[PDB]
């Protein structure tokens, strides 16, 4: 791959190339992306969306994404400095700066959880199951193998890609984020037939991939190098910060001057994240060659020298947090809530003339496929409050 | 038609004619009807029944019916005065007085909403749907076309007719209201094959129609002239008063000495209702001839000179009130509540020997048809509290 | 004043000067400040703290501070660019960059609401009143005029200064933010005898003021120039964004392609903020001379050409939002909650040996003054949930 192309400032619809050297410092494309996300309706909605984790402080999805983005900016900034020293022409010729790299990773990391449905992975599985063995099965014969697969294996990252680019009468291209940011956002650059985009966004990513110059591999491409840093920010934060929350929560049983547990835990978290950030940067530059070639077959943290302690932390979290009664009860309830909303929307879609279904449309509100993936997208992005409430009214409460 | 006969004081079961001139002033039949309604169990129950409309003052169904009856009494009183001047023999010979007309319309208007199920029109549609495509469908082949139609197109006005006349071991003829009052109550004098009576009350209305001398038109007859005034009271009140409530509620965004909004709105409502009452009276006398002939094909307000402002008010109410999220959520929940209660009652009716169904009967409690229309009648007249509670227990709460 | 000194990277306790040119790009002092705020316990707590403003999206204090910081970064970045063009030596000699200015204003703006008590200004007044006419009055004769004034006129900005610098056994200097950031944070550089710091932090600000070279004016100094940008970000956001929220909330009655109100409102908000940001930058550079001299006697927005529309927006917000029943009820309840917690803490402080007061200390937990200002600080920073709950238990619920 080529860095000059990987750092594209192209926005959907552009008819002409944007040159880094021409950019207005006060309106840097990559930095503008961060600000568009912050003020966006979907990001804002994260304020009212909790993680599956259940007093002390516990992150909602908005604060979790904020902290992940801060870790992301530091990772990008650091790699950026080293990348410009290794490839000095990027700066002296093309005008790129180390903070451009922090901006790209920060923005992509900030929006990473933006399209995930409530209830974490159980939420995704509930949606998938709805179309596999639930009411949604009825559409199987009216869809292609990939359109149907999109539904059966509904993935939050693909929905996030849709949320960030969705076209609307008064807003084509959605947030119209820089292509380098969309590339950094894509962890799995492939179709449903652990994938990064639905059929509804295939045309867009092809344009993004071509523009970035991603190595071609039923389409798929090599991962944009900066996506490795977006992934690391996630790995680091979900590992250490969720551990921090589990402790403050009590689920995980618990410098010498600090008298409060949360302060001791916070200091350890900061030190630990700092160590992993520094190491992740070195690992990236160490395998930068393979990453640019598309042969690197793992994550940055996979190569960590603290893989053992990292593994022990993830297992204890799975043990005390994800296997906790509170989380399991929430996920179970989540299946019923999502399954109910999806069925009510699909039945209204099928029989749109009945008084009841019209009410449902008034309450909760193209080809069959566009209508179905849109239903999945809207149900997935509903705030916790709206979803529970709409569910309760449908069930007669 | 003939007024002397249209003003019948006959009560169900009478073997002899009641003469107006013989009436005891302190026990005037039509006035007695009003008092029987007031003290009746079904009217009283309106105290605990809300409209679909969601702080300021908002009418429950009892207060709404009370105000409609006051408007009704004024309409009847005024038309009555003019009718006796046009047909002086009604008074000088038969002894009728202008207040008899106010009494008839007032009583009929007071009881007009008495049999409607909760959730307004959505409530009616939920009941209908239950027997059309829900569990109730199973009875289709055991009923006649009209008995089944009664269920599939369940109408609250027909149920009100049943509620007012239902026979019970210690109470035959129900409230035994004057026939002129029952005629004024009937907006649609026809069978299910926008109808005014179920098959279960067909025999009664035939007796009422014959006694009143209603023009014959699968039976149907010309509307009793005073029903036009009962209808106008409804039209006027649902139009202006619901608008008043929508404003005080905030759903509808908002003399010079009045400082409070509710007082300004109340004054306007009073002035507006007064204008429509006066105009409705003139319209009735203008078309009195056609109405007596049964050729008048519309409502009194249909002929209003303020039809435009009336139309704009109804549309804004539909827009800000009926299409409001609060109303839609309530109607949606209403479908589930009514559908659940009906199914539980029909399953218990079908399999009455199981322990569970016996409990259901103990909790919620003839030919198949009488049993089914009775189930619809009882579910429809349950107070809001009883319906929601019984529903919750059935659903395990 | 002198920019080279106003841009100090000094952190509390430093024994040696930090030079901009020596800074590690990946650890820029001003950028590090932003990250320390994000991950801090007091900033995180904003997640669970609502504004007094009461469905659509409505900002919690965390998201409000986040958006204010974004507006702040843009203001600083833009002024920064123009400042370096006017004073080229700052960059060519001292090594300052335009993003350093965005970093300083962004960080200061991000933390601006960090120490404010719940219930906005009513919250502040409730605390003040507690020591003026409530139980807290009893300490009047044991305190100096300024220590007591700190309490009677308790100000959230002063508490925020304390929160950001509070010393603790394992954490001296609190977040140890750069002095340029602390200066930008200070809107009112003076004592209680609309002030920016309590007696408990007087020693710290004197050090900050001396280091920055703030013009001396019972101490007080001229405002750090960048504080004008922090203030503008606040003015712009509280004006436009609160208006946006009031509309989406319904409290404020409500491009041509956008079909949803929130999208139309969001677009207008973005355009409006953009206009004010651009204008505020020009206003700053226009009066940069006076600001550097300490003679500028107003805010940047005070000089706006849209002062009228700005005034109309603020008045409508005061009218439909702050005077709304929901807000007034909350503020009223807020007085009782805060007054109760303060009294329980002061009584326990006075009579610390009783079983009850020991329980109170166990639940809710120096010179008299340090203990009292600490009680005000802790009560002020309690999340909404903890405050209400602790209040309920004290009242026997």
Chain A residues touching residue C49 (CB < 8 angstroms): none
C-alpha distance from A258 to closest chain C C-alpha (Å): 4
Q: Break chain A into its structural domains and give their ranges.
A: 1-116+153-225, 117-152+322-397, 226-321
Chain A residues touching residue C66 (CB < 8 angstroms): 38, 66
C-alpha distance from A357 to closest chain B C-alpha (Å): 9
Contact B252, B320 (CB under 8 A): yes
The beta-carbon neighbor of B391 closest among A355, A363, A396 is A396
C-alpha distance from A152 to closest chain B C-alpha (Å): 29
Beta bridge partners of B221: B216
Chain B residues touching residue A353 (CB < 8 angstroms): none
The two structure tokens encoding residue C265: 């409102």
Torsion of CA A144, A146, A149, A153, to 10 degrees: -160
Q: Is residue B77 annotated as involved in ligand binding?
A: no
CB contact under 8 A, B332 and A393: yes
- Quote the CA–CA distance of C175 and C166 in Å, as a whole number: 8
Beta bridge partners of A190: A220
- C216 — phi, psi (to 5°)? -65, 145
Contact C181, C10 (CB under 8 A): no
Radius of gyration of chain A (CA): 22
C-alpha distance from C242 to closest chain A C-alpha (Å): 14
DSSP state of A139: G
Beta bridge partners of A171: A168
Indicate the burial class of C325 (C-beta count within 10 angstroms; 0-12, 13-18, 19 or more). exposed
Chain B residues touching residue A397 (CB < 8 angstroms): 333
CB contact under 8 A, A45 and C57: yes
Contact B260, B330 (CB under 8 A): no
Contact A366, A340 (CB under 8 A): no
Is the CATH number of domain C1-116+153-225 1.10.3210.10?
Answer: yes
Q: Give the 3-state secondary structure of residue C191.
A: coil
Q: Give the 3-state secondary structure of residue A50.
A: strand
The two structure tokens encoding residue B350: 């079908």
The CB density around residue B219, as the number of other CB atoms within 10 Å, is 13
DSSP B225-274: TTHHHHHHHHHHHHHHHHHHHHHHHSSS----S--SHHHHHHHHHHHHHH
C-alpha distance from C41 to closest chain A C-alpha (Å): 8
Q: Among the CATH numbers 3.40.630.30, 3.40.50.300, 3.40.30.10, 1.10.3410.10, which is that of C226-321?
A: 1.10.3410.10
H-type alpha helices, C252-324:
261-286, 288-293, 307-317
With CA atoms as reference, report the closest residue to A288 among A78, A96, A83.
A83
Known binding residues of C: 27, 35-36, 51-52, 61, 64, 74, 112-113, 157, 187-188, 194, 234, 242, 269, 322, 331
Residues comprising chain A, all counted: 397
- Quote the CA–CA distance of A340 and A394 in Å, as a whole number: 8
CB contact under 8 A, C258 and A169: yes
Q: Where are the beta strands (DSSP E) in chain B?
A: none
- Quote the CA–CA distance of A26 and B14 in Å, as a whole number: 93
Residue C269: closest C-alpha in chain A: A39
The beta-carbon neighbor of A396 closest among B325, B328, B336 is B336
C-alpha distance from C314 to closest chain A C-alpha (Å): 21
Indicate the burial class of A264 (C-beta count within 10 angstroms; 0-12, 13-18, 19 or more). middle
CB contact under 8 A, C47 and A60: yes
- Quote the CA–CA distance of C268 and C244 in Å, as a whole number: 9
Contact A57, C41 (CB under 8 A): yes
Contact A156, A196 (CB under 8 A): no
With CA atoms as reference, report the closest residue to A54 among A109, A124, A125, A120.
A120
- Quote the CA–CA distance of A204 and A333 in Å, as a whole number: 35
B248's torsion region: left (phi>0), alpha (psi -120 to 50) or beta?
alpha
Long-range contacts of A263-271 (CB under 8 A, 24+ apart): A263/C41, A263/C168, A263/C170, A263/C171, A264/C170, A266/C39, A266/C41, A267/C170, A268/A244, A269/A240, A269/A241, A269/A243, A269/A244, A270/C39
Chain C residues touching residue A168 (CB < 8 angstroms): 258-259, 263
- Resolution number, Å: 2.0
Residues of C near A (Cβ–Cβ under 8 Å) read 25-26, 35, 38-39, 41, 44-45, 47-48, 55, 57, 59-60, 62-63, 66-67, 70, 74, 77-78, 81, 98-99, 168-171, 255-259, 262-264, 266-267, 270, 385
- Quote the CA–CA distance of A243 and A276 in Å, as a whole number: 15
CB contact under 8 A, A396 and B340: yes
CB contact under 8 A, A356 and B332: yes
With CA atoms as reference, report the closest residue to B301 among B339, B333, B273, B329.
B273
Sign of CA dihedral B374, B380, B386, B387: positive
In this structure, CATH architecture of domain C117-152+322-397: Orthogonal Bundle (1.10)
Chain C residues touching residue A257 (CB < 8 angstroms): 169-171
User: Which of B129, B327, B332, B384 is best to mutate for the A interface (most A CBs within 10 A)?
Assistant: B332
Chain C residues touching residue A55 (CB < 8 angstroms): 385
């Amino acid at each position: 791959m080529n860095w000059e192309h990987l750092l594209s400032l192209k926005r959907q619809g552009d008819t002409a190339k944007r040159l880094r050297i021409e950019q207005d410092d006060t309106r840097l494309g990559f930095e503008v992306d961060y600000d568009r996300i912050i003020f966006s309706a979907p990001f804002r909605s994260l304020q009212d969306k909790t993680q599956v984790i259940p007093t002390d402080f516990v992150h909602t999805r908005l604060t979790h994404s904020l902290e992940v983005s801060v870790v992301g900016r530091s990772l990008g900034r650091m790699v950026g400095k080293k990348l410009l020293e290794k490839y000095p022409h990027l700066e002296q010729v093309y005008g790129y700066k180390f903070n451009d790299f922090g901006a790209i990773v920060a923005a992509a990391a900030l929006a990473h959880d933006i399209g995930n449905p409530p209830f974490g992975h159980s939420g995704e599985k509930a949606i998938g199951e709805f179309f596999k063995n639930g009411y949604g099965k009825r559409y199987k014969d009216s869809l292609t193998a990939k359109e149907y697969q999109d539904l059966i294996k509904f993935e939050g990252n693909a929905n996030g890609f849709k949320v960030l680019s969705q076209s609307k009468p008064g807003a084509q291209g959605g947030l119209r984020l820089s292509y380098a940011t969309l590339g950094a956002f894509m962890k799995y650059p492939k179709e449903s037939l652990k994938y990064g985009f639905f059929q509804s966004e295939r045309a867009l990513f092809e344009d993004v991939a071509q523009e970035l110059g991603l190595l071609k591999r039923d389409v798929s491409w090599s991962r944009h190098p900066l996506a490795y840093l977006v992934e690391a920010a996630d790995d680091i934060c979900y590992t250490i910060i969720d551990f921090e929350d589990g402790i403050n929560l009590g689920l995980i049983p618990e410098y010498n001057a600090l008298q409060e547990t949360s302060d001791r835990v916070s200091y350890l978290r900061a030190l630990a994240i700092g160590t992993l950030i520094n190491e992740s940067v070195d690992t990236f530059m160490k395998y930068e060659e393979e990453i640019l070639a598309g042969t690197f077959d793992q994550s940055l943290i996979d190569k960590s020298n603290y893989q053992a302690q990292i593994t022990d932390i993830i297992n204890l979290s799975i043990e005390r947090i994800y296997n906790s009664r509170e989380v399991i009860e929430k996920e179970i309830a989540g299946y019923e809530i999502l399954s109910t909303l999806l069925e009510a929307r699909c039945r209204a879609l099928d029989n749109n003339d009945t008084h009841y279904n019209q009410l449902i449309q008034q309450l909760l509100a193209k080809s069959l496929y566009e209508n179905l993936i849109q239903i999945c997208a809207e149900v997935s992005t509903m705030t916790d409050g709206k979803a529970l409430r709409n569910y309760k009214k449908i069930k007669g409460l």
